[PDB]
Design a protein around this ligand. Structure first.
Ligand SMILES: Nc1ncnc2c1ncn2[C@@H]1O[C@H](COP(=O)(O)OP(=O)(O)NP(=O)(O)O)[C@@H](O)[C@H]1O
Ligand SMILES: Nc1ncnc2c1ncn2[C@@H]1O[C@H](COP(=O)(O)OP(=O)(O)O)[C@@H](O)[C@H]1O
Ligand SMILES: [Mg+2]
Ligand SMILES: [Mg+2]
Ligand SMILES: [Mg+2]
Lengths: 139, 7, 372, 747
């Protein structure tokens, strides 16, 4: 990272500082990485965090300087398409089925998150154009 | 038999 | 499937039948007759020789020979005639299809068993066979595994002690006295009362008198006194020509010679004393179980009163404290065949047969090792 | 290996025979698995084993226990449990076999609309139901001229009668009709009364094989029915072990005695007569014998046995009871005699119309005839008691045959029987704390039926493999023939027992010793229990079973002295007693030999025919409606042989898929590069990529055949791929929405 990147990342980090100490919680580190363009799994975030225990994850606070090596380490389409083609073969995906899989498999998300991302993209039949949705969510 | 008796 | 033949050649009666059934279905005398007079009528179908019940029916014009004298087969082709008559005429069974079980007295020459075997395999082609000791079979008959068997047929008498299924071969006694020679003695004592039976056909009549009228005197002396003093003891019998003959003391005097062989001239003591001298050759732990069983077998033990005479004088010899029991089943004339009938139906026994393969490998010598 | 985080495995437990556990740490090849239990356990892997895996849940609950990709005990005991408890479905296939569970509760499923629903449908069209067996038997009988059998096996009370009843109701309704089923059903009271017993484990245990053959005419209307019986347990008449009873009718009879009709019989209480007394358990709860008597006579009357004959039958049974009391006083080891003026024999001869002094003479003597000459000779008190009991057995067996023949005379219809379908109710494999000659025979008849089953199934799978053009040898014949030769060959256990009866001074000690000498190390199926010289073990198909020698030489003896029968035929006091015998080697045959012969008649009757199999299980001891207990269930699933049927099916190719359904499951694994529009060849390519070894799958014309554990592996890798895709998508979206809240935070 160059000076400009370090400045933008620190500024972003400080916007997420909800206590004024120039720090975020470990549990926000992943959020900052995602806000900064990373797409880590919860497992990857915990791994770069050093698999913290619940207590230090929830209350130990780290400043930008300790977070930064983790962001660096984290920083270092066709599969995404096949992944969407998993749930198809007319190029569509049920909104109900996507809701079910997102709320029941993997690193399960809430129904509200899924409603938020799915809002306005499904048609009357309940089908999602996944290539368009993917391009939209990758921009 | 063969000796000590008739049969 | 196939059921072994069980065949006892004896002396006198052949008795034969299938294994696994209750009684012989062929019983007939082992006698072979040849005609001795001149054939006069032409076109009669006159026949070289007769066997069994035929020779009994025609005996007026025949010489009758017994092919077994003292349990030794003396003439071989008259014996082949008797076996041929048994299988084809009496049982009507082809011998190739059936194992055969054959019966013999102990301490008789080995050549007898060898010839019996060589004939059964080579000329009858019997698929398997065995040769069994007559005494051993009478315990299978009476349902025992222990006892001293006293067995007497025509010809040979023998004692064989058995204890828990082991024979004790050093203690076997054999005695040539029994059965036929009672008849030859009976002819000489009848001559004293003025009847003369010489020819071989007349002997068959004497033998039937012996079967009907003889009985064993319980005390020999008192009965000779009685019959000398009275006529109460005297019975009369009718010959085949309607003559009538009358027999007094003599009828008990005949079977007494089993108990005192001196009369006929033999060396040895009577059956009671070879029986006791046979128990005395056994070790002392088992005598108490031998005295508890004495098993009579074969037809010479069917005289009235012979069981009670045995029990009396063996009790007189034996130590005082013991039960002497004599077991004399009313069926004892057949006991050797009934025992062989049981033995040949066991499944354990199906390994014991001499099969034709082993004979073709090793020849008639095998019988001595593979059989007892 | 297959064991991973997110795995599941079955672990054994005392109180439900298996319980689920989740594999809490990935396992690497060492004596430990971390397991989580629905909380925490550590479980030894022990010599080695691994615990049985748990089937992926899309397979659990389907109609066929061979559809499971892991086939093992806890999978069966799981499917039958969920399907019975949750669905209330009581019928389930195991391959060919239908398994049926007794609900102890009525159900709507037997309604006539459903009778119509099953008719004409093949086994594929529908869920399992008993009508789906009856329908197959019917249509095969029509399709191909051969007769058909239906074979029903289970612990008594597992509903074999109700299964047969609804089976024949299917025939009556489908054919049209003539009132057979009413008659057949109405026979059951009497054949329960003469034919069943109490047993240590059961009441109304049936001790015989009942074969009901329904005849059809050339229209395939029902003509009528015959009945045959096999394998009757004759030895129970005279000997019962503790907490057993004699056949019910003796206790119905004794409990009746206060009734006027039976005043003449002089019946005592049930503890007076030596044949009822011994097992010491006169009274059953939940029944009143005195009512059951009335129900028996009422069934006799409905089947049209005149009251004169009924009083005949009860005469003869009072005869058997009184005969039992006769006592012999030995005078010698050779000889025995009856006490003078001895009352039981006086009552027997009065009941039976014979001379007191003839029976007094012939019970104690036996007669042997040469061609020319005949002897009467005495017999020991042991041989006398053996003969009295052989006469009791021979009377009872003839009386049973006569009642069955009268029932047949009322069931027959006088028309040419074009073909028949036959329904066999027979007992299953049996094991107690103590096993004795009856159990030995029952288990041998099950070894024979299990062989027939295995051989039939093997033929069917050879036909299916030729139908899919797959070389045969891949499936091969597992065979219980060495255990049958162990039992019934010459120098087998039965042969050496029948030998030991006639051998002099036979005893159970010398018998056991003969067994050890003959078999002890020469056969892998015969074993000696380590601590006893009086017992032996046979490794039957279901399990090892230990038998005591202590009974068999008493029980195995039949010999009947013909003279005692010729005495009984002379009876003129009443018609039935000579009529029973009216009818030479059979008088010599031992019980074991008659059992073999009856079993050969049965196997010839079934080999004439093409079988269909049903199995029945009690789910609990206490008749609780729709409640299921794993510890009785696993017992009966062994006893019924289902748990070896599945073991034999687990070798080979039990999992079968059509290529279309295979796409419908597994498009997800295939790249659209890999898909041809030739589907069959697509799959031939893909599966060879995905599963490395050509062994574990056979291609055939319309199906794929899989070794057991493979479809589970495919489900595992499918779930893993689908999860990985879900992870990619959801992290992408959840990162976008976090970035979108960051967009709000910059703003
Ligand atoms: N399919 C079924 N539907 C309803 N009840 C059933 C069913 N199968 C069995 N039962 C019940 O199970 C009980 C016994 O069945 P049943 O066939 O009469 O046994 P059983 O009289 O002992 N004959 P057995 O099997 O030889 O002992 C009865 O209460 C039936 O109602
Ligand atoms: N009822 C009888 N009383 C006395 N002696 C008999 C009787 N029956 C047969 N015998 C004699 O016994 C012999 C036949 O006995 P048996 O046992 O048949 O001989 P084997 O055992 O050699 O066949 C003959 O000497 C016959 O005289
Ligand atoms: Mg003899
Ligand atoms: Mg019932
Ligand atoms: Mg029943």
């Amino acid at each position: 990272f160059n000076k400009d990147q370090l400045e933008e990342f620190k500024e972003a980090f400080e916007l997420f500082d909800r206590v004024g100490d120039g720090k975020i919680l470990y549990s926000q580190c992943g959020d900052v990485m995602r806000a900064l363009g990373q797409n880590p799994t919860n497992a990857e975030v915990l791994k770069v965090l050093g698999n913290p225990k619940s207590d230090e994850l929830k209350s130990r606070r780290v400043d930008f300087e300790t977070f930064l090596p983790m962001l660096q380490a984290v920083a270092k389409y066709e599969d995404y398409l096949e992944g969407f083609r998993v749930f198809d073969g007319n190029g569509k995906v049920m909104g109900a089925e996507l809701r079910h899989v997102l709320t029941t498999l993997g690193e399960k998300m809430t129904e509200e998150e899924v409603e938020t991302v799915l809002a306005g993209h499904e048609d009357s039949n309940g089908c999602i154009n996944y290539e368009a949705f993917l391009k939209h969510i990758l921009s | 038999w063969x000796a000590x008796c008739p049969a | 499937e196939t059921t072994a033949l069980v065949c006892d050649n004896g002396s006198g009666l052949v008795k034969a039948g299938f294994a696994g059934d209750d009684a012989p279905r062929a019983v007939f005398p082992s006698i072979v007759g040849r005609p001795r007079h001149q054939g006069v009528m032409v076109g009669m179908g006159q026949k070289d020789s007769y066997v069994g019940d035929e020779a009994q029916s025609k005996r007026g014009i025949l010489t009758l020979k017994y092919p077994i004298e003292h349990g030794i087969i003396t003439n071989w082709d008259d014996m082949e005639k008797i076996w041929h008559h048994t299988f084809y005429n009496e049982l009507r069974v082809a011998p190739e299809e059936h194992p055969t079980l054959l019966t013999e007295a102990p301490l008789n020459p080995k050549a007898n068993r060898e010839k019996m075997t060589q004939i059964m395999f080579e000329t009858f082609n019997v698929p398997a066979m065995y040769v069994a000791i007559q005494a051993v079979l009478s315990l299978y008959a009476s349902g025992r595994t222990t006892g001293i068997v006293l067995d007497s047929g025509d010809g040979v008498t023998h004692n064989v002690p058995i204890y828990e299924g082991y024979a004790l071969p050093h203690a076997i006694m054999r005695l040539d006295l029994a059965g036929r020679d009672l008849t030859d003695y009976l002819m000489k004592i009848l001559t004293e009362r003025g009847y003369s039976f010489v020819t071989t056909a007349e002997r068959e009549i004497v033998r039937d008198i012996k079967e009907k009228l003889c009985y064993v005197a319980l005390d020999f002396e008192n009965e000779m006194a009685t019959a000398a003093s009275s006529s109460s003891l005297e019975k009369s019998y009718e010959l085949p020509d309607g003559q009538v003959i009358t027999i007094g003391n003599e009828r008990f005097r005949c079977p007494e010679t089993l108990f005192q062989p001196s009369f006929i001239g033999m060396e040895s003591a009577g059956i009671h004393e070879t029986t006791y001298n046979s128990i005395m050759k056994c070790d002392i732990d088992i005598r108490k179980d031998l005295y508890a069983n004495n098993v009579m077998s074969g037809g010479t033990t069917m005289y009235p009163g012979i069981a009670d005479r045995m029990q009396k004088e063996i009790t007189a010899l034996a130590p005082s404290t013991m039960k002497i029991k004599i077991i004399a089943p009313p069926e004892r004339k057949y006991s050797v065949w009934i025992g062989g009938s049981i033995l040949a139906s066991l499944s354990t026994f199906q390994q014991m047969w001499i099969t034709k393969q082993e004979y073709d490998e090793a020849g008639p010598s095998i019988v001595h090792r593979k059989c007892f | 290996e297959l064991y991973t985080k997110y795995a599941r495995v079955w672990i054994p437990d005392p109180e439900e025979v298996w319980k689920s556990a989740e594999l809490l740490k990935d396992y690497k090849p060492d004596k430990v698995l971390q397991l989580r239990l629905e909380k925490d356990l550590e479980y030894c892997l022990d010599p080695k084993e691994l615990p049985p895996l748990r089937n992926p849940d899309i397979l659990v609950g389907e109609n066929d226990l061979t559809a499971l990709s892991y086939l093992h005990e806890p999978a069966v005991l799981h499917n039958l449990k969920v399907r019975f408890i949750d669905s209330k479905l009581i019928y389930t296939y195991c391959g060919i076999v239908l398994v049926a569970i007794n609900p102890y509760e009525q159900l709507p499923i037997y309604g006539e609309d459903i009778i119509n629903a099953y008719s004409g449908q093949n086994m594929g069209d529908m869920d399992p139901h008993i009508f789906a067996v009856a329908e197959e038997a019917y249509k095969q009988m029509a399709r191909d001229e051969r007769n058909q059998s239906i074979i029903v096996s289970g612990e008594s009370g597992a509903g074999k009668t109700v299964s047969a009843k609804y089976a024949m109701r299917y025939f009556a309704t489908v054919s049209g009709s003539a009132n057979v089923e009413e008659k057949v059903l109405a026979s059951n009271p009497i054949m329960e009364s003469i034919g069943n017993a109490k047993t240590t484990r059961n009441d109304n245990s049936s001790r015989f094989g009942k074969y009901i053959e329904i005849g059809f005419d050339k229209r395939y209307r029902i003509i009528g029915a015959n009945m045959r019986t096999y394998l009757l347990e004759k030895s129970r008449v005279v000997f019962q072990a503790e907490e057993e009873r004699n056949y019910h009718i003796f206790y119905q009879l004794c409990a009746s005695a206060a009734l006027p009709e039976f005043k003449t019989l002089r019946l005592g209480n049930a503890n007076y007569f030596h044949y009822t007394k011994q097992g010491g358990s006169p009274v059953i709860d939940g029944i009143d014998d005195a009512k059951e008597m009335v129900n028996t006579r009422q069934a006799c009357t409905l089947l049209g046995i005149s009251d004169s004959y009924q009083m005949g039958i009860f005469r003869i049974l009072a005869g058997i009871l009184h005969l039992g009391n006769v006592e012999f006083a030995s005078r010698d080891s050779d000889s025995c005699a009856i006490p003078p003026k001895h009352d039981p024999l006086t009552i027997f001869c009065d009941l039976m119309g014979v001379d007191y002094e003839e029976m007094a003479h012939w019970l104690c003597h036996r007669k042997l005839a040469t061609a020319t000459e005949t002897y009467i000779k005495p017999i020991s008190k042991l041989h006398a008691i053996n003969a009295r009991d052989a006469l009791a057995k021979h009377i009872y067996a003839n009386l049973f045959n006569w009642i069955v023949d009268h029932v047949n005379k009322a069931l027959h219809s006088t028309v040419k029987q074009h073909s028949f379908i036959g329904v066999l109710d027979i007992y299953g494999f049996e094991t107690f704390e103590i096993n004795s000659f009856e159990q030995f025979c029952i288990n041998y008849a099950n070894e024979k039926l299990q062989q027939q089953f295995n051989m039939h199934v093997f033929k069917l799978e050879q036909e299916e493999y030729m139908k899919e053009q797959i070389p045969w040898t891949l499936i091969d014949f597992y065979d219980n023939q060495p255990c049958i030769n162990l039992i019934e060959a010459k120098m087998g256990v039965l042969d050496l027992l029948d030998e030991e009866c006639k051998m002099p001074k036979g005893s159970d000690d010398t018998w056991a010793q003969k067994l050890y000498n003959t078999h002890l190390n020469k056969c892998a199926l015969f074993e000696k229990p380590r601590l006893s010289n009086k017992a032996f073990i046979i490794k039957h198909f279901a399990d090892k079973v230990e038998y005591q020698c202590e009974g068999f030489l008493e029980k195995n003896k039949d010999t009947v002295y013909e003279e005692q029968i010729k005495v009984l035929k002379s009876s003129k006091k009443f018609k039935l007693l000579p009529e029973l015998f009216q009818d030479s080697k059979e008088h010599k045959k031992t019980v074991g030999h008659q059992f073999r012969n009856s079993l050969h008649l049965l196997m010839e009757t079934l080999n004439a025919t093409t079988p269909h199999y049903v199995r029945c299980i009690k789910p609990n001891d206490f008749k609780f409606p729709f409640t299921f207990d794993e510890k009785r269930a696993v017992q009966q699933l062994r006893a019924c042989g289902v748990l070896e049927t599945i073991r034999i099916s687990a070798a080979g190719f039990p999992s079968r898929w059509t290529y279309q359904e295979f796409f419908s499951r597994y498009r997800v694994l295939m790249k659209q590069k890999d898909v041809l529009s030739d589907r069959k060849q697509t799959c031939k390519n893909v599966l060879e990529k995905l599963i490395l070894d050509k062994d574990k799958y056979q291609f055939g014309k319309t199906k794929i055949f899989f070794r057991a554990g493979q479809v589970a592996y495919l489900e595992k890798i499918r779930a893993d791929k689908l999860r990985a895709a879900c992870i990619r998508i959801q992290k992408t979206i959840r990162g976008w929405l976090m970035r979108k809240k960051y967009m709000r935070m910059r703003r």
